[PDB]
Design a protein around this ligand. Structure first.
Ligand SMILES: [Zn+2]
Length: 258
């Protein structure tokens, strides 16, 4: 028995095992576009993914992660509201059972079909494990997905999902270029928050892109074929693995654009 997205172990129950669930800087949150403040001092994001080295893709039960080699500054994020260099360690998605829901963050209460999270850690801390214990330890780039035209750069990911259908399964996943998942514009909103899954640590500087990317109905459909369960167990479709918006509290959302 442990946390999940079901009726008996869902987000509403997490606070019992992880008290920080009711903390002061929890994520996700609803982004009120008319309350966000334009900050002229925010620098443009610097995404350097030309030397990225993907290694594997694994179904860990709550979603699937595409892992990268983070032993050197091969794929890093700098600039924006960040001070220092952040290395990409993995990316994963959150999606729904229907196209009308799936994203964690919302924009003026609007929900998207899914949300992509590219997780990076501050190299000043030596490793991911130490980074999550710091208020400026992680930087997660969030990208919304809407249903429309297919995204070519995402197809390699969707085609391998069959090989990691159940929890615990992993497969070699080399030479995947994450640059194919980025929108044209890098305008963003940023705020201090937390991880959206347990341990829910408040160590994240969120960078949410304004421009969503489009994926086809067929592509998102394949995400919904994954299982929360492990092989040999009752089938439970992996859908709606998103946490609802949390109280903004004493926080301000800044925008890099007018
Ligand atoms: Zn996530």
């Amino acid at each position: 028995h442990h946390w999940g997205y079901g009726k008996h172990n869902g987000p509403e129950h997490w606070h019992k095992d992880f008290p920080i669930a009711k903390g002061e800087r929890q994520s996700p949150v609803d982004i009120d576009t008319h309350t966000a403040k334009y900050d002229p001092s925010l620098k443009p994001l610097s995404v350097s993914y030309d030397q990225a080295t993907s290694l594997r893709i694994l179904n860990h039960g709550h979603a699937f992660n595409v892992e990268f080699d983070d032993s050197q500054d091969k794929a890093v994020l700098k600039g924006g509201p960040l001070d220092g260099t952040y290395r990409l360690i993995q990316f994963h998605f959150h999606w729904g059972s229907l196209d009308g829901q799936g994203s964690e963050h919302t924009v003026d209460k609007k929900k998207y079909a899914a949300e992509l999270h590219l997780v990076h850690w501050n190299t000043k801390y030596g490793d991911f494990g130490k980074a999550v214990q710091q208020p400026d330890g992680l930087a997660v780039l969030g990208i919304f997905l809407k249903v429309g035209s297919a995204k070519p750069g995402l197809q390699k990911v969707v085609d391998v999902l069959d090989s990691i259908k159940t929890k615990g399964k992993s497969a070699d996943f080399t030479n995947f270029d994450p640059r194919g998942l980025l929108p044209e514009s890098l305008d963003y909103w940023t705020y201090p928050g937390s991880l959206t899954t347990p341990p829910l640590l408040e160590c994240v500087t969120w960078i949410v892109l304004k421009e969503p990317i489009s994926v086809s109905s067929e592509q998102v459909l394949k995400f919904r074929k994954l299982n929360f369960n492990g092989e040999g167990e009752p089938e439970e479709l992996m859908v709606d693995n998103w946490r609802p918006a949390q109280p903004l509290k004493n926080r301000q959302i800044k925008a890099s654009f007018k």
